């Protein structure tokens, strides 16, 4: 397949290899994010408006 101004292979090894065996696939990586949220903060007396 041609991408940009280049010629590259393009292959997925889920069928040739890894098929019907108990080793998982390596390209399914893992992202990691850490959330945060405030529990009981109290806005000052000037931002209490509807």
């Amino acid at each position: 397949v041609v991408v940009g101004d280049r010629l590259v292979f393009l292959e997925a090894l889920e069928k040739r290899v890894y098929q019907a065996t108990q080793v998982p696939y390596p390209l399914v990586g893992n992202l990691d994010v850490t959330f945060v949220m405030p529990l009981g903060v109290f806005k000052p007396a000037a931002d209490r408006y509807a």
């Binding site: 098929q19 019907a20 065996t21 108990q22």
Partner: protein, 48 residues
């Protein structure tokens, strides 16, 4: 006592321990069990 000659070849390449529901009896030995060798037999010895 497994089979001696296979009739026709299979085509699918799929793991099988997860599909043990479809079959009636299912036995998986690890590698070269020493049990499938011994072969005994009954016999009838002469008729009068």
């Amino acid at each position: 006592r497994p089979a001696i000659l296979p009739s026709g070849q299979i085509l699918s390449n799929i793991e099988v321990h997860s599909h043990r529901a479809l079959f009636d009896i299912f036995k998986r030995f690890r590698s070269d069990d020493n049990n499938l060798y011994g072969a005994e037999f009954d016999a009838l010895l002469g008729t009068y």
